[PDB]
């Protein structure tokens, strides 16, 4: 009738069809052409060393048993046909928890052409491992990978290819950036062979080059250390006899610095080494705690309890009014040129 001509085409395609066997099981290798359309590169979790990515993962392969001759060259079908045909067992090697979306229907695509060439697109949100080396935190850059390949079929059975040029086979969408801490610099693909206990498997790598934007850790920690050190520098311009004022000055600057040291290591994991921000934290601790030792030396070397023989201005404070701000100022030009410039 009207759609009976296509019904007897689909029922002829699926008659005597075994979806347990790959196309050309005993005669050839089932090549799979792959491209990824990244619709949103999601947030990167520093604490869990992971990242999120929403894709339009496409696979294409040739099936010799799905050839038809009809009034339509392409059969743009729904997803019930996809479960009744052979589809490759592509899985993500460094994935942690991925979701194939199915609201309101399963987000899949299936387009058989008249010679058997298939196209299989899916919506996935892949949470993948991005191992990080945070020795230059927060002025660091990472290359978060995304490896995928077959699970059961080895290199002699199913090989994977990019359908376009490899520089153009991973396309990130224009608005596809849910990144608020990093910014994506560019994608980078590679293809290789990985060996396991079962056999050798073709793996397709996609590296996403990320760079952290220091916009937050300035206002958050760097500038409170600068204001805490420059705060603890003006205690030398106070009176020599003023013991409670400079005493509470030193102890409150030490408390603000030692609570900056605690809050500094949050939302990044408990790594064994020390970051660049931790070295900065150590120096803005040293240049606060060295002021109070100077004040203790002055208080040991001071005399009468008023400001008759009046007291004299300390020589220790006059050098510390000049040496301590410049030894801070030389350090910041050394620290920021070492890490931020390279």
């Amino acid at each position, epitope marked *: 009738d009207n759609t009976t001509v296509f019904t007897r085409i689909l029922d002829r395609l699926l008659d005597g069809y075994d979806n347990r066997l790959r196309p050309g099981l005993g005669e050839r290798v089932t090549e799979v052409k792959t491209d990824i359309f990244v619709t949103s590169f999601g947030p990167v979790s520093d604490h869990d060393m992971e990242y999120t990515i929403d894709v339009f993962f496409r696979q294409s392969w040739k099936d010799e048993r799905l050839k038809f001759k009809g009034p339509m060259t392409v059969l743009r079908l729904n997803n019930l046909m996809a479960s009744k045909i052979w589809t490759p067992d592509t899985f993500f090697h460094n994935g942690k928890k991925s979701v194939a979306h199915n609201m309101t229907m399963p987000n899949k695509l299936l387009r058989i052409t008249e010679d058997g060439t298939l196209l299989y697109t899916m919506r996935l949100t892949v949470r993948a491992e991005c191992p990080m080396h945070l020795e230059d935190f927060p002025m660091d850059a990472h290359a978060c990978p995304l490896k995928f390949g077959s699970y059961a079929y080895t290199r002699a059975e199913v090989v994977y290819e990019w359908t376009r040029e490899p520089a153009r086979s991973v396309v990130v969408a224009e608005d596809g950036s849910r990144l608020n801490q990093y910014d994506l610099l560019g994608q980078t693909v590679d*293809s290789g062979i990985v060996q396991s206990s079962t056999g050798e498997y073709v793996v397709m790598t996609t590296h996403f080059h990320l760079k952290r934007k220091i916009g937050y850790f300035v206002i958050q920690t760097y500038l409170p250390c600068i204001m805490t050190v420059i705060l603890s520098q003006v205690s030398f311009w106070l009176n020599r006899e003023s013991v409670p004022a400079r005493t509470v000055f030193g102890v409150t600057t030490v408390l603000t610095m030692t609570t900056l040291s605690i809050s500094a290591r949050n939302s990044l994991p408990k790594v064994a080494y020390a970051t660049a921000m931790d070295w900065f934290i150590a120096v803005c601790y040293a240049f606060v705690f060295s002021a109070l030792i100077e004040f203790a030396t002055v208080n040991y070397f001071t005399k009468r309890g008023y400001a008759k023989t009046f007291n004299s201005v300390s020589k220790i404070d006059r050098l510390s009014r000049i040496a301590f701000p410049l030894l801070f100022g030389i350090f910041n030009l050394v620290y920021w040129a070492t890490y931020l410039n390279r």
Partner: antibody
Amino acid sequence: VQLQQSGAELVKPGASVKLSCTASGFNIKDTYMYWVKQRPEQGLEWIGRIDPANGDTKYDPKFQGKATITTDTFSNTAYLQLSSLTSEDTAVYYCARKGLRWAMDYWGQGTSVTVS
Amino acid sequence: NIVMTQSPKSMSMSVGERVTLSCKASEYVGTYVSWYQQKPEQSPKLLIYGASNRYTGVPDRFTGSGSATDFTLTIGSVQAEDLADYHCGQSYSYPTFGAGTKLEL
């Protein structure tokens, strides 16, 4: 499994020449078809790209305009169109099948063009 | 574009020793280079695909090697019938080629 090209061509400069190669043993709808230029005592220069299942073509920016690539399905054949031939276009041309891991597997025997 | 800068122009050694080539890439091509031989009056034949993958019919003496940017092709005990010209390509982007390394006695 065999890529058979046309014969040698000798035309005057400024004219146009049709150049072709027929692919056998497979179908050109699967793999990409590449064109490449080999000057005498020089290296290879890639001409352009064509996707016969799609019709999409991509060209070298130094070869844009003066050359275009066409194809057809029934004859399983790729074609070259060359316009405004000069002295530096005197070279030998090959058509390349895209193979395993984008490697230019098969090559034609080579058609050499000559201007005078 | 991607510029292939394979060196040197020609190597002149005898038969029965190890000879290596080199191909430097301007930008990243990741294990997508290829090596072809060019006999006089002959179409090119593929030798290595990927970075170091021996094609069918290639003898075992032809051992390539690859990386992200630096590439090389090592020949062990080169014979007299290998006296041809060698080309270096890439296909990570739109394909380019090198100048060409020849062999001499």
